[PDB]
Amino acid sequence: SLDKQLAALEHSANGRLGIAMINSGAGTKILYRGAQRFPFCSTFKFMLAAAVLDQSQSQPNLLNKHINYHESDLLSYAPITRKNLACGMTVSELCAATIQYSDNTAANLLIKELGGLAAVNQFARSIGDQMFRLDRWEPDLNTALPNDPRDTTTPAAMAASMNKLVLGDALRPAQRSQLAAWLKGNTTGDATIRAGAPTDWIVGDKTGSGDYGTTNDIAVLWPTKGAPIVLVVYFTQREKDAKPRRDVLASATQIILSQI
């Protein structure tokens, strides 16, 4: 039914579709391949910023530590860090660049600042997420090889972690609002979940893309008009150099939100 709809959609796009939708207002969930591993690509940056915002509770002044960096830190996608190379940036500025632009160098500077890759994995365990695993730095974590467990999570686990962080009480209200705000002001997701949603709902989201035409989006949606919704949509294809399919994420989103 909903299965056959999602199964036909993913078949028509030559790939595998991973979906978790949570409605905290009713508690209900919707899963499709919700316990299968998918390469998370840049959507891990949501967990990264949440880890910094988490620490900003213990250390308030963290959001203002100034980070100097070097030409050697720059990557192909580093719009904000490239611009500020000769001046450096604050931890809060790196978070915003990381979430709202998917700046790869900003992400790497934040990983190092948190205490390395192990620190991100530790943070996920600390909120009860046993599926998340970060194995590489940017941009290597986007290889997305089929059935490769590195840099993966499951849709259900990512949805549960986002729900706890953006809507649950894993963060204090200001941190939570800051995270929602960064998500809400994301500029990279106009053609994904935001497209398939009602046009007056407000959406906050983090995209990801990788090889194998991997196209990801994770979002909190605020209906005007009801209780908030967490939607994870992960999509990966069979051909290594396939074009991304943001339309498929749009189609999956309107198929899912039809059930509400």
Instruction: Write down the catalytic residue from 1, 12, 24, 42.
Output: 42
- Burial of residue 70 (number of CB atoms within 10 Å: 0-12, 13-18, 19+): exposed
Tokens of residue 156, six digits: 């259900």
Provide the domain count of the chain. Answer: 1
User: At CA 156, angle to CA 55 and CA 161, rounded to 5?
Assistant: 15
Tokens of residue 63, six digits: 């959001």
Cα separation, 93 vs 190, whole angstroms = 22
Cα separation, 33 vs 88, whole angstroms = 42
Cα separation, 92 vs 154, whole angstroms = 28
Residue 258, domain extent? 1-260
Helix and strand totals (H; E) in the chain: 10, 9
- Resolution in angstroms, to 1 decimal, for this deposition? 1.9
Q: Is 209 assigned a catalytic role? A: no
In contact, 117 and 137? CB cutoff 8 Å: yes
DSSP for 9-75 reads: HHHHTTEEEEEEEEETTT--EEEESTTS-EE-GGGHHHHHHHHHHHHHHH-GGGGG-EE---GGG--
CATH of the domain at 165: 3.40.710.10
What Cα–Cα distance (Å) separates residue 128 from each residue in 125, 151, 224? 5, 17, 30
DSSP helix/strand/coil, 122? helix
Nearest to 132, CA basis, from 236, 51, 213: 51
Q: Which helix (H) or strand (E) holds 89?
A: strand 89-90
What Cα–Cα distance (Å) separates residue 147 from each residue in 45, 117, 160? 22, 21, 22
Technique that determined the structure: X-ray
Query: Which amino acid is present at 232?
Result: V
In contact, 235 and 252? CB cutoff 8 Å: yes
Cα separation, 198 vs 205, whole angstroms = 15
